Design a protein around this ligand. Structure first.
Ligand SMILES: Nc1ncnc2c1ncn2[C@@H]1O[C@H](COP(=O)(O)O)[C@@H](OP(=O)(O)O)[C@H]1O
Ligand SMILES: [Ca+2]
Ligand SMILES: [Ca+2]
Length: 754
């Protein structure tokens, strides 16, 4: 079955359902949230002979017990025939020999992570085995009465142990398909070393406590080493007891790990010149080399995470120039909140990891100086945010600062009690790796996060504050012409730039008006490369910008990338008859001296068998798969709303573009509506519509657009009639669902089918 988790929750805002979804999202468990049927409608469970869900979860198990008989029998038949368990949440239960009304069963088969060292369901039957005892709050049914095992919880996922039991139940009922290895990796980053004016710095007792705590935690976690964020300027600037305490930290230079972390603790996004930023880091490197600090760890952290997300190219280049940084970390990708959504990415040769916080901040000096009270730190340690981060994430980077190792040394005490809690309650093997080894482990576990998902910095206040002030905000287009190719996109592009309120981007060096940002390696070039094609918004200028790229239509990664950077953009896809589109795109390749289009006739290209060249298969894929209009539009329907997408008839644009452009302007909502009837004039020599300049002169497209070639033969037309027949029927249903008018060729093709 598919690894999707079928989630039934009473409403879209219930606390128990959101807690389950939060656990599944933290564990990268794919889920499909649905409204629980109160004798209503059961969604489809099997597709193409195989089930679509490996595990179902029920936040109100009474909606399964009191389920309608036809749906209940369908669900029970599905779960028996595919081995899918039921996680429930909550007199005798109806349909089961179980009555309804904290220790741990040590021999329970649920236990994969939970260590048994430290409403109830009770009756007399052997079809269930209890997991948590009170009689039995959490019971694991053995499937000896119904047929398939189910785990029923007597309470919510509020307690930390119940979350630990829940992820064990997810692992067991799936068959250890939706689970993680017991190996856990932790790296603690101590920030702002040698930062401060008076007080809260290293004394001799603070360094000795830091060294001793690292030694004793090395017995718990093998090779556990602290990472120190030094800062060379605020050296020997504290009290007399703190001048020696800073000097005592250089005696233990071979006992810790160090990362550069700025010369004078200034945000790198304030550095609009790279060379002065590199000279700052060279001063910090000179300090580290002189004091014996190692300069080969390959890891660094910006003082406010300024310039890692959004990308300040000067920070990335200076890190690789002065330090050869390979790993950094941030808490800004994709957003600061919630922390469970934080991912990593690899950009510009630097692997970025999601940095987390242990709850200890810069202002946290004393135990009672911690905000919320000293019990809030103990709550976070003993089954709070600390424990849940280690449990649900394989790799964690925890943030701590200079003040967390001061008078009370809360950084020591917090990680002391956390590791004791982890090894007394879990079977997890805690490890500590160097940040290079830690990052490689992260992108081997999560290989889908190796590509970044760019966003607009000015849509988030936190991202705007750590963005360079020399970069303007709305330098992004509002209209995307996605294609497909050879449908008339250049004529639509050339007639849109004539509008005074609308501005087109600068042409590229090779791809000209096409940027091809969202569908290839140009996405990895960054958003600052993308902003160079669109002029500075200024004030007294046309603030509406558009760009065309015909390869965005059929691309799979382009819609989600375009929706991430430009969620408010308008999508313009134009369609002609796909038999004609395939033929024109075939003849266009012949006109560009493509050697496999010139070697094979159009009938041979479309009748290409599997036992042929890969060049022919690439051309056949290029001719036919973009003609699957229903497939590619549905990809863009997953990313953009229906009202942000307009589907034009390219044959209508071929004949009457003036009414087409009126539909475009009412789609784009312009103010200076151009009368294109007097502005566009049909050119008999060209065969298409062109400009009507002053004096009767006409400005047409080049020879590449609107070519002339012999007509398609009847055999190839007959093949493209039956090939696209189910595609056009799906396209007709799709365009009817969107509320957009069917094209003239589409309605004609349905009439020929009838
Ligand atoms: N005013 C116009 N000028 C040029 N081509 C136009 C046009 N209106 C529609 N077209 C069509 O645009 C197609 C090319 O689409 P694109 O500009 O995206 O490459 C041409 O197919 P052909 O060039 O095979 O005759 C032509 O039929
Ligand atoms: Ca800092
Ligand atoms: Ca800080």
């Amino acid at each position: 079955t598919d690894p999707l988790v079928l989630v039934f929750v009473e409403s879209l805002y219930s606390q128990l359902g959101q807690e389950v979804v939060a656990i599944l999202e933290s564990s990268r468990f794919k889920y499909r949230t649905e409204i629980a049927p109160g004798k209503g409608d059961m969604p489809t469970l099997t597709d193409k002979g195989r089930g679509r869900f490996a595990l179902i979860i029920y936040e109100n198990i009474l909606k399964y017990v009191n389920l309608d008989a036809w749906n209940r029998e369908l669900l029970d038949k599905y779960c028996v025939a595919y081995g899918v368990g039921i996680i429930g949440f909550f007199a005798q239960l109806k349909g089961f020999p179980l009555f309804l009304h904290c220790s741990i069963n040590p021999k329970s088969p649920l236990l994969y992570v939970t260590r048994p060292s430290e409403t109830v369901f009770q009756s007399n039957h052997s079809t269930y085995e209890p997991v948590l005892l009170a009689h039995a709050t959490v019971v694991q049914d053995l499937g000896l009465h119904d047929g398939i095992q189910r785990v029923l919880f007597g309470n919510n996922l509020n307690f930390w142990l119940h979350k630990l039991v829940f992820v064990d139940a997810v692992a067991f009922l799936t068959g250890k398909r939706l689970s993680l290895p017991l190996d856990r990796y932790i790296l603690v980053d101590i920030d702002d070393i040698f930062v401060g004016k008076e007080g809260t710095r290293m004394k001799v007792e603070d360094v000795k406590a830091l060294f001793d705590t690292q030694n004793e935690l090395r017995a718990h976690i093998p090779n556990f080493t602290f990472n120190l964020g030094y800062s060379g300027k605020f050296f020997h600037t504290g009290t007399n007891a703190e001048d020696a305490g800073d000097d005592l930290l250089l005696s233990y230079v071979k006992e810790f790990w160090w990362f550069p972390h700025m010369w004078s603790h200034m945000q790198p996004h304030l550095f609009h010149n790279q060379s002065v930023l590199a000279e700052q880091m060279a001063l910090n490197k000179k300090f580290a080399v002189e004091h014996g600090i190692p300069t080969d760890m390959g890891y660094a952290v910006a003082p406010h995470h300024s310039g890692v997300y959004p990308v300040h190219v000067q920070l990335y280049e200076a890190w690789k120039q002065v330090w050869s940084i390979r790993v950094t970390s941030t808490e800004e990708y994709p957003h600061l909140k919630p922390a469970r959504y934080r991912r990593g990415f690899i950009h510009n040769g630097i692997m970025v990891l999601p940095r987390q916080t242990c709850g200890l901040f810069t202002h946290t000096i004393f135990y009672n100086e911690y905000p919320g009270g000293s019990s809030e730190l103990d709550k976070i340690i003993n089954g709070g945010e600390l424990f849940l981060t280690v449990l649900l994430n394989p790799i964690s980077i925890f943030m701590t600062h200079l003040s967390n190792y001061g008078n009370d040394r809360l950084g020591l005490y917090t990680f002391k009690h956390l590791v004791r809690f982890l090894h007394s309650w879990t079977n997890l093997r805690l490890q500590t790796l160097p940040p290079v080894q830690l990052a490689q482990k992260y992108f081997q576990i999560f290989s889908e996060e190796k590509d970044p998902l760019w966003q607009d910095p000015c849509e988030d206040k936190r991202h705007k504050d750590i963005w360079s002030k020399e970069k303007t905000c709305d330098r992004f287009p509002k209209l995307l012409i996605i294609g497909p190719q050879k449908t008339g996109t250049t004529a639509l592009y050339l007639f849109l730039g004539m509008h005074p309120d609308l501005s087109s981007n600068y042409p590229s060096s090779e791809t000209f008006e096409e940027i091809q940002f969202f569908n290839g390696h140009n996405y990895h070039k960054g958003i600052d490369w993308y902003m160079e094609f669109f002029p500075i918004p200024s004030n007294t200028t046309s603030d509406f910008y558009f760009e065309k790229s015909a390869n965005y239509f059929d691309s799979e990664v382009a819609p989600r990338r375009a929706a991430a950077l430009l969620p408010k953009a308008k999508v313009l896809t134009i369609l002609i008859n796909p038999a004609d589109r395939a033929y024109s795109w075939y003849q266009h390749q012949r006109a560009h001296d493509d050697p496999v289009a010139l070697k094979y006739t159009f009938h041979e290209v479309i009748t290409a068998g599997s036992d042929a060249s890969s060049k022919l298969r690439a051309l056949q894929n290029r001719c036919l798969v973009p003609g699957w209009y229903a497939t590619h539009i549905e990809r863009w329907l997953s990313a953009y709303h229906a009202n942000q997408i307009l589907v034009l008839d390219g044959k209508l644009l071929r004949t009457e573009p003036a009414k087409v452009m009126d539909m475009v302007q009412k789609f784009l909502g312009v103010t200076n509506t151009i009368d294109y009837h007097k502005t566009l004039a049909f050119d008999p020599k060209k065969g298409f519509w062109c400009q009507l300049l002053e004096g009767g002169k006409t400005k047409c497209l080049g020879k590449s657009k609107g070519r002339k070639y012999p007509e398609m033969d009847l055999d190839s037309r007959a093949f493209l009639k039956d090939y696209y027949r189910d595609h056009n029927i799906e396209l007709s249903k799709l365009l009817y669902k969107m509320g957009q008018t069917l094209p003239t060729w589409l309605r004609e093709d349905l009439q020929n089918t009838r």
